[PDB]
Amino acid sequence: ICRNRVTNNVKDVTKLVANLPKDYMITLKYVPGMDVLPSHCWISEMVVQLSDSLTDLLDKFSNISEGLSNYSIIDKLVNIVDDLVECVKENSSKSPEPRLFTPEEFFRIFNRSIDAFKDFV
Amino acid sequence: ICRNRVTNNVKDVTKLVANLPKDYMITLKYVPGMDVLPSHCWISEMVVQLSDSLTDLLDKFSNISEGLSNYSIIDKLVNIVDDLVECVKENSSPEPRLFTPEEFFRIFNRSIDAFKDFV
Amino acid sequence: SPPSIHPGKSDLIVRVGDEIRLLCTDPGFVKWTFEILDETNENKQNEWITEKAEATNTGKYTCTNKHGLSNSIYVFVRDPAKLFLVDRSLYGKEDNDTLVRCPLTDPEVTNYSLKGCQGKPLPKDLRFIPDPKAGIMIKSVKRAYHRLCLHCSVDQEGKSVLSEKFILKVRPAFKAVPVVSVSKASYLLREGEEFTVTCTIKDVSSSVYSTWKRENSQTKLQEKYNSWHHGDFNYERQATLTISSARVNDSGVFMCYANNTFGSANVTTTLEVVDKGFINIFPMINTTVFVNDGENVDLIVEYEAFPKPEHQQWIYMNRTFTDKWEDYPKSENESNIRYVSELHLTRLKGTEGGTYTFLVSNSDVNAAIAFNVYVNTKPEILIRLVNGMLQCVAAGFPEPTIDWYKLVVQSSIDNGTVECKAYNDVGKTSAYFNFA
Amino acid sequence: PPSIHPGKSDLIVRVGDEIRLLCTDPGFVKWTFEILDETNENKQNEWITEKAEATNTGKYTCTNKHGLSNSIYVFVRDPAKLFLVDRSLYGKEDNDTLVRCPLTDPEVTNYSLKGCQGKPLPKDLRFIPDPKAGIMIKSVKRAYHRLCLHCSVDQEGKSVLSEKFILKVRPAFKAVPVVSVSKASYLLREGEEFTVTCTIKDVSSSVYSTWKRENSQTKLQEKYNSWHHGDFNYERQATLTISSARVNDSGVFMCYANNTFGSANVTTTLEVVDKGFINIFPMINTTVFVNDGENVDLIVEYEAFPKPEHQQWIYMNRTFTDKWEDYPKSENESNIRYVSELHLTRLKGTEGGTYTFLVSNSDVNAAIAFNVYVNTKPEILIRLVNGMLQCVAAGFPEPTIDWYFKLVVQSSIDHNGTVECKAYNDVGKTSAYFNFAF
Ligand SMILES: *[C@@H]1O[C@H](CO)[C@@H](O[C@@H]2O[C@H](CO)[C@@H](O)[C@H](O)[C@H]2NC(C)=O)[C@H](O)[C@H]1NC(C)=O
Ligand SMILES: *[C@@H]1O[C@H](CO)[C@@H](O[C@@H]2O[C@H](CO)[C@@H](O)[C@H](O)[C@H]2NC(C)=O)[C@H](O)[C@H]1NC(C)=O
Ligand SMILES: *[C@@H]1O[C@H](CO)[C@@H](O[C@@H]2O[C@H](CO)[C@@H](O)[C@H](O)[C@H]2NC(C)=O)[C@H](O)[C@H]1NC(C)=O
Ligand SMILES: *[C@@H]1O[C@H](CO)[C@@H](O)[C@H](O)[C@H]1NC(C)=O
């Protein structure tokens, strides 16, 4: 359920990783042990945190019309995650510590979070 | 002279300034008073310093096939900034300081626009 | 009675750091409850103490008791550090009122207000009502305000002080129906071929529901889906349907069908699956034709064929015909099944009549049709003396008739002259001999 | 010649130690000190320092009245900084190059050169030390471009590394520049704007390129575009224009490039005309004979500038039309030869007459005319009066009448009788048989 809300755009994530400085730093509240426990425990808190962090990151770039600016891609991903939030809040119906990540890793956490929906009670 | 080594790739610089985090930090060994006349005193040292800092910025990104990328644009900037060193050094260490990209590139463009007028 | 709380006033201010001590006096004591925002706590002692400082203690304290009895007291811990308590979540349904969680930790302030980021002013149409216990509320949230970013703001000591920062988000209410379009229109296929058709939907939101179903049945077929977000409030879906190999049963109506909470629409298409192929022919004129010397005639066929034609040819009297003919489809539409050829006979010379035949081929079938041709000729006439009798001899298709004053006709006769004349529809001619 | 104390060929000193010297001459002038770029001269013939820093490491030279001189070279052990470095590096293709990695503590070994990030060196970089300064790399070749290096010693069995060096190389020219021009040749009516482009491709920005009016020595006005298309791959475009042509502007223009390997040139020609024109050539003689039911085609080659703008066919002042084709005589990029043919089939006798074909362009219009005679076998006729037999024939040519038993002719001849008139012209034969009986 909700699987159809994730439009295919996510493939762009590989392009986006490549264009950010490999020592820029990105900031997230990270649910402990979420790497370990079965999906349905952590997923609810995690998906909120992502939407927050991303909307912060979006302020940093500037739009251009030509081609695929980073600003374009990020603007679309925000639209995906928010409707996942609504979908869980309406179909399923404490704050971790702040944490820092390099780009590659951070997107890995995001990508696995998406994958959790491709089969979810 | 050296008015020909400057290929027209520089127009891309405005695109590049858009596609970088406005809070990222860049480090340059700045000649004091490069903000004042004449051109000729600071220009000689300045092109060397620029070549170094740009080289390391190129070390960050990764190459990608389809559409423009930061890596690609930065590379052609390095090729120009090297040619000018060869031109000045064969025709003719300030402190490390930190800039957001908009400030830094304001410096860079002013430096290039010093050429196309010269001794 | 409800339970009595000591001291019984509605509201209390307390210093950050000061002790907080509340007692509930009821024989029926059960519970204490503490609420701020989404944080909540309970106690089963009949008295509540907290000697330490926390600003976060601020909010509501409730006491409950045996017969059902309940009473509550509300509390401030004034902190110069922490004027707001805050929650950076913010969502609104279009056309409803919406609440911004920045309730105030010390109520003794004025000009409690809402303000736009970075100096930029708020759209004029907003009207909103504050309250220190909730935060601040925005009326009738509407689609202009999407991604709008906010501060809520207060004046203390004439200095103007700002909340941590908020971005508002709005999710749309459907004013209109889905919009539905289909990749190509109607389909015809030779049996045992793959069949593939695509349906596309433009709509305001990713929540839209869409399906493929086959006329007169409710088995959902297998289908595969692809989607894009082309900007704000702008969503697109494509669906594709396939039959790997057709069997003639597969003929019929197919329907693409869409629904959202406002209403619905469709698009239909029809597949015909046929076992084999054909060529079918119609002459534009009668098969046999009559024409004068040096006259002009054009011959025409219209024909329906599938699969597409392989070659047409035009041939005459155990011989070819060449380069005086055209053959082109009757219509340019993708659906086109129908084809015409025309062939010119022009300044037709008088002997060339006979039989003209047309042949056409495709992968499965060959078909041929023939026309026959006879020539209107002015009479052509001649004389032969035989014995005592004088004979007058004339030819033409169609026959000449003669008066005294190819079909071959003969007339025999029993001072001045013998004149012999023949007439046909095509013309006339005559003969003269005389006696003195 | 001068004398220096202490008199070894070096000295080796602890970090912080005061460094003490006298340059011993009655012919003393100076002490002269340097390493890398930094350099100093001082007037004391004693030379003295309060406490040795690593930066004192290097060569010192006692400077004297003959210009006879003597030198001593000085090292400081300083366990933080085994290397001193200049980060800048450049190499001319196929020469050798020297890598600024001089050493502070000349008591270490295994001193050698190694790849960045653990990668291997390409196998060919034969390299030589001199711990007095640097490491040298022989015969730099184009594959090393923007390679990355570290400079390294074994010391106490530990392994110790410089900061990165990144190596960039200047190309040297194997070959001459390569040249192309936007199109080969031109024609213009007077005053039009005229424009051309010339393209050069090469390894470097330092290629030299100019336009010269043919057989004239003076440079014209031109404007430039260039791109670096990746490594060793540079492209230039040059554009030349005359805003409005006077006729004397006709002739030849040349684009020319030079580089230390050699030179290449490409050339283009221009003709300016005061007016348009049209010129016409028939296929066949203007006047043509055919026979009834035969076929004939009327064919013209004509050359025109500017392009043909009206083309029309008329017969006997009326539009006999739509049996004709017309097309450019060639597909080459500047063809102005044009061909049209008109095709007549199963021509009938009375239709003989006059045919004209006509062209206009904006500047000029021109017309050509043909006349045609279709010949026929004769027809024949019979008349009589005053006992004359009269035999009368018409055709082409004038037919010939012999008696036995639009060209026009007649003749006459004065118990049961059958006599006749039998005739041909060149086109054919016919026979007219009479019978007149008492
Ligand atoms: C349009 O939308 C809703 C679903 O969004 C349809 O709801 C039906 O609900 C029943 C169960 O209660 C399901 O079994 C059906 O599958 C749903 N219908 C369809 C066509 O799928 C609703 O029927 C649709 N029509 C309207 C007017 O809302
Ligand atoms: C698409 O869905 C609706 C409901 O089946 C159909 O609505 C009909 O549309 C026509 C033309 O407007 C009306 O005459 C009918 O009265 C509507 N109602 C019905 C029950 O037919 C629509 O036409 C549908 N599909 C097809 C193939 O027509
Ligand atoms: C212009 O182009 C032509 C052909 O590239 C050159 O013509 C040659 O000139 C030399 C003498 O200079 C002759 O020996 C050759 O036989 C010529 N033909 C060829 C194919 O080489 C000409 O030299 C060029 N002139 C300039 C100034 O560049
Ligand atoms: C290249 O350009 C200049 C100018 O014409 C000329 O002096 C020189 O001889 C040319 N050839 C070389 C190898 O430089």
Tab-separated table of C-alpha atoms in Angstrom, chain A residues 4-9 48 51-52 55-56 58-59 71 75-76 78-80 82-83 85-86, chain C residues 88-89 91 146-147 165 167 169 171 205-207 225-229 231-233 235-237:
chain	number	residue	atom	x	y	z
A	4	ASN	CA	2.159	4.137	-6.325
A	5	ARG	CA	2.941	7.447	-4.610
A	6	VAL	CA	6.676	6.978	-5.304
A	7	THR	CA	7.021	8.251	-8.853
A	8	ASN	CA	10.013	6.854	-10.733
A	9	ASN	CA	12.017	10.110	-10.431
A	48	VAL	CA	8.960	12.596	9.127
A	51	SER	CA	10.931	15.622	5.040
A	52	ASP	CA	12.211	18.161	7.550
A	55	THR	CA	13.200	21.153	3.170
A	56	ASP	CA	16.135	22.681	5.032
A	58	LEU	CA	16.401	23.027	-0.452
A	59	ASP	CA	17.054	26.596	0.756
A	71	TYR	CA	17.292	22.656	-7.074
A	75	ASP	CA	12.083	20.137	-5.193
A	76	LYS	CA	10.493	17.007	-6.683
A	78	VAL	CA	10.122	16.752	-1.293
A	79	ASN	CA	6.767	16.283	-3.043
A	80	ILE	CA	7.201	12.513	-2.900
A	82	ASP	CA	5.273	14.493	2.025
A	83	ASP	CA	2.594	12.343	0.455
A	85	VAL	CA	3.700	10.994	5.325
A	86	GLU	CA	0.022	11.584	4.652
C	88	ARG	CA	8.091	22.480	12.994
C	89	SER	CA	5.369	20.318	11.408
C	91	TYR	CA	0.117	20.970	7.022
C	146	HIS	CA	2.016	26.797	-0.810
C	147	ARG	CA	5.635	26.619	0.448
C	165	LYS	CA	11.027	29.158	11.280
C	167	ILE	CA	7.185	26.403	6.079
C	169	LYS	CA	2.303	23.102	2.990
C	171	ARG	CA	-2.734	19.616	-0.216
C	205	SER	CA	-2.522	14.697	-7.624
C	206	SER	CA	-0.812	11.322	-7.153
C	207	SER	CA	-3.880	10.052	-5.226
C	225	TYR	CA	2.652	1.915	-14.741
C	226	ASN	CA	4.940	4.963	-14.986
C	227	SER	CA	4.593	8.468	-13.538
C	228	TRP	CA	6.119	11.972	-13.409
C	229	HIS	CA	5.699	15.125	-11.266
C	231	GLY	CA	5.852	20.848	-11.110
C	232	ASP	CA	3.523	21.817	-8.290
C	233	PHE	CA	-0.029	20.397	-8.310
C	235	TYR	CA	0.941	14.816	-11.762
C	236	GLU	CA	1.050	12.429	-14.698
C	237	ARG	CA	0.580	8.684	-15.092
